[model samples]
Target: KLNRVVVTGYGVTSPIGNTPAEFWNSLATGKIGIGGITKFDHSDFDVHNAAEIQDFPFDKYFVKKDTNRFDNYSLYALYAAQEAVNHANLDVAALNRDRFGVIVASGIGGIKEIEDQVLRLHEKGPKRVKPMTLPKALPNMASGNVAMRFGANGVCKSINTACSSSNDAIGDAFRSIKFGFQDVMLVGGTEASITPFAIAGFQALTALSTTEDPTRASIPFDKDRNGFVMGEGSGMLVLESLEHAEKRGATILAEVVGYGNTCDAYHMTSPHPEGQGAIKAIKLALEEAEISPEQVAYVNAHGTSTPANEKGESGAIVAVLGKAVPVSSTKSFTGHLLGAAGAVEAIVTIEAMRHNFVPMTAGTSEVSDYIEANVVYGQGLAKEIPYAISNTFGFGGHNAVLAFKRWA
Candidate 1:
């Protein structure tokens, strides 16, 4: 029942760029998306910078009437999904509707909507709350709205495994096609949680950076690194079975050869001290991919710039793939997208595989003593990447790894 699954196309709404080509260009030039937080009044707050997307062309994608009903999170997902479907050049009417599906994810869905509605409820009583609040604020709305938009009748679901949400969604879609349940899937993660509540909460956890300098805010492998800079966006990929893709004459982007997911079971916020779970997750992906460690040309680390994660991930990469393999953290450019990071980095990895260029850690110049792996710094490195693994770790100790191989 197992079949080969491959990525045919992808779309993104990120701090750096909106389209795949634009994103790739920014990454190649080592663009930094982190900047002063303009989404809200952060004057009184310690955390000042974030990776926020501005000037989104909502008019081009959503109709005026329907826009009010859906939250920004859903809109971001819809926009990215539209781009992905078009990029894949899918003719929905020609395909089997029952065999198409969607798996969009978010760690904190519609937080902006919830925050606004809560204010209404407290200030103006129960009657002031918006009627569409529940439908718009719920976590599953991203997937539901995408399904309704595309007429996808099969296996529409949303994943919320914290930061690993999108990776888990992509992994689920890969299995769906691999096990012959679906012919095609629109899978990715979205987030629009750069609100007062989310920021204050993460600040309380001390999980966000307080650095005022944008360039130095998210330096992942640096000795002075403090915490992750919050980011808001969506990353979507079109995955189809090889047979279905070939029958349609689709251009294959890369092959999804392996996926590994595990939990530390040690802490909720912190990773296992010695990266026990991460090592196991990497090993599992290598096993599923059936590729030796030496064959891996790159490692897209879950380098959130947090003290524990960067060191732990570096140790895990060295323990599993050795210190010689090239590694980089796109989070340095995009900040930490939390639920959407995995999908964003997945697209980043595919682009690296396609272009044979590993992007540098945008803001990092010096590696920490804790880091033992060869972290890409300054300008990107132009080299052949036949196979790469992108890792994502989330709160509650969720670890997900996806192995992508270039289709020659």
Candidate 2:
């Protein structure tokens, strides 16, 4: 039997905030988390600004050894997952291990670990590479370790669809329940690639802003925009079949009614100028949702602040959802979380619905006239949002959309 899927729980360890309360509060109040890079010495790199997780309370959840054993991405994932479980008040001891699934994603997994290990190999020897090197660096380790943590035995997989990875992960989890394949899923994405290597690579592509000013570094939809500010963190959501959630007395945050996955297939990194892929994906999500375009009240944009990115994205939203809905990007506040962007933005979207508020695209003072959508900036907007959608377009032409309906 086909089942409806509802987001029962969620958590995040992000540049913006770590707890759900603080995450929502920061979004509601327009807090800027972007700042000077402290993850590493960026003096050697021209691009400097980044959104790294600050003041993480590690002693509360992790042992001292976890810092060395797992990559930052994995730690963020595991931390978020625990918060999600607590938020859901889920008794893992009672759940069916066979039907419970997990799908956590990462765009560039363990890059920091690999970077360190490669250096050690050069300085020391092959044997000194460390036994945990591969385990720490592998992309699948996040999901694998999460599975073992919860004893999740069903459908455990990791997605790496560039920035759209977690959107696909959530979409995959939603489908598994909608198609009667799984009962519950812990799905999201994590990223911790704010190292010298990732910064150098993005700088090489000219994808990162060279601005030293943290306030203007990630100004999505602004006229003076340049490029995205790299962000490192994780966002995890617990998706349960509506039937199961209701039976378990779980409080449903939102109903995930539809998803759209498409590819531009036009360029390796740059989005198609016309945004046909993103337009089609948004249309498909609304179609699958069976909701009229007017019913969609908000669109959490994939606005990375790149001059090449936002205009096309705004075009896509207006093409399908009309120009009336409030379109804004939380990336302005949290910076671009890359693979984890969609997941974090998804949480932001859901929080918006619950509060009946549309978060401002922080740092955007002048919305470019060329952008056709009703872009929200400066102050948050209050509106009745029965339905909302979040968009995530990744490198390699991937466009993933998820539609959420505010639960009654």
Candidate 3:
């Protein structure tokens, strides 16, 4: 028999909130975090707004934090991972450290540092590049740093499937536990690419919103949405085998029942208008869960507020789960977190299950007329979400879906 996986703990550092409770409160109360881009001069680009973490407790959370040494993404990853371990009440000395693992994901990882390094090299010679540049810019360091810090000696790696990175990381961790490869996994995603280079790149592709209105900057499912608002942050989770959590008397927050990973292989950025790969992904996840579409209480859509994405995702959901299933886009509140979207939304989904609440698609006044799925707008709805799915579709054809069952 395959082993079961349960979430013992979770943490996040997002645009809206730094702590898990703070993040949940934003959803429950319809709080939107998108605002003007203060990190850099957006006067050069059309995309004026972003969902950025406000007043981060960097000094409070770390001892050796530096932009050149660790990069912003690594800092976010380390901070969130520390919160996850502490939230799990994990006693490292009491457990088998050899069985601990880490699988974090990042779509752009350390792009800010890379941008500066590129400028430095061009301005002078290669010597101008910081000696510590390599370690700081690499995406794998997000996972490597966490593994070293927590002493997760088993199976440490990172995933880079763009927006779907986190769900894939979580899926890999789920399988690792299910197949009995590791007892516990620190699985999540982080991204901090809100820089001048990154912004101008996305703006050129027309994949980012240019609206000066913060309210509608990242509006998902809205009829007039232009593109996604870039958001930066990290989310981490402590996933343990059911047996391991039970034996250690760990607080089981939720159970990961199934995961589906598929690709359209058709588009570089836009999802196919019909959502073929997305439909298959959802079906495969439900199949693995041994549950039908009716059992899925809510769906956290990979809604980036882009027109094509909304079309494809809605079609996919309607084709599989039908029009009655409640669906909402946390991206409306948090913006497109890119790699970190799935993990942050996964935490929100788990908390949704805990509170039996369906958060609104914040800032979305209209959810598109062609959409058939039940896209929630303002106003939180209370419903027992016994089973839910958090969907993440990366740029390129990557599609990853996760099926979560409330442990209670």
Candidate 4:
């Protein structure tokens, strides 16, 4: 039999707000984190607007030099993990080190840092690059550093599956704990790919909005919606088996009842126009949870503001839950956090459950006719919560669904 999994703590860092308080506040107030791109000069690029994390305090999670050596992705993972660790109040001295593990995901690790190093190699010299460059730039550095800092010595793995990277990491970690490999798992997802190359690449594919106005640029579901505005940040959650958490007298936030993952395999960049892959994932999650589609009350959508994807997701949800789900995409406020998008959105979904509020998709001017869910607009909607599912489909047609329930 599988062990019960529950969320003991949660953490996040996003353009909507740095800490959970800020992120939640923005969500409650219907605020948008999307704005002009400041990562680099956007004059050369067609997409000028993005939701980038600004003014984050790394000292809250790491020492100045420790952070200096890590890339922004690692920094995001560490900061978020630190928040979760502190909230969990784990006594490292009391717990067995070998039984603790960490699994974090990074969709595109250290793009900015790598770009800088490559530029240095071409302009100045290889010797001019910082000595700490490679270690910080590696994608695995995120989980490695997180485990080292928090003393999680077991199964410190990092995942990179484009946008689905972090969700897969968390899902795998959930299975690990369920199989009794670890008593506790610090699992979450993160991404910081807001660089000139990332922007240029997405723009070249026409996957980014060319709209000059930030407010209207990222409008998902609306007829005028264009494409996703890139965003960066991390979402961390502390997961513990019911027995382990109960024995330690920990506060349980929500239970992770189901985790389902699938891939379309049909496309490298775009989703299957019919969304057959995502539909299977959603159905699998509901079946695993032993619940019918009618039991799902809310959905945190991966509404990237792209016309095809939004319509596809709406169709999938409608097909699964009958178009009655109060579905919203926090991405309108947080942008898309790449690998971390699902984890953070899951956190938002659970929190909305706890607070009896449903988050609204930011930047949505109007709902499209084909979309089936009761679409939320600029303001948050109040409602009682029971079960919520947060779905994320990544670049390579990877579809992930996490089923969460409110705990009494």
**lDDT values, one for every candidate:** 0.93, 0.91, 0.92, 0.85
TM-score of 4: 0.97
Clashes of each: 0, 0, 0, 0
User: Candidate 1 lDDT, tens digit per residue, 1-408?
Assistant: 689999988999999999998889989887888999999999989999999998676787778887578998998899999999999998889889999999999999999999999999999999999899989999999999999999999999999889999989999999999999999999999999999999999999999989999999999888889999999899999999999999999999999999999999999999998899999999998899999999999999999999998889999999999989999999999999988999999999999999989988988888898689999988899999999999998999999999999998
- Residue 310, candidate 1: how far off, in angstroms? 0.7
The true-structure Cα RMSD of candidate 2 reads 0.8
lDDT of 4 by residue, 1-408 (tens): 678888888788888877778889888987888889887888977888888888787766567677568888988888888888777786777778898999889887878889999999899998889888889888888888889887887889887777777778778888888888998988888888888898898889999889999998877777788888899999999998888999999999998888889999988988988888999999888887788888898999888888889888888888888766788888788887888988888889888999999987776776877677678886788999899998888888899988888988
Where is model 1 more than 4 Å wrong at Cα?
Answer: none
Candidate 4's C-alpha runs over 4 A off are none
Tell how far residue 81 is off in model 2, in angstroms.
Answer: 0.6
lDDT of 4 at 80: 89
TM-score of 1: 0.99
The candidate maximizing lDDT is 1
The residue pairs that clash in candidate 2, if any, are none
- Report each candidate's C-alpha RMSD, comma-separated, in the order given: 0.8, 0.8, 1.0, 1.3
Lowest lDDT 10-mer window, candidate 1? 54-63
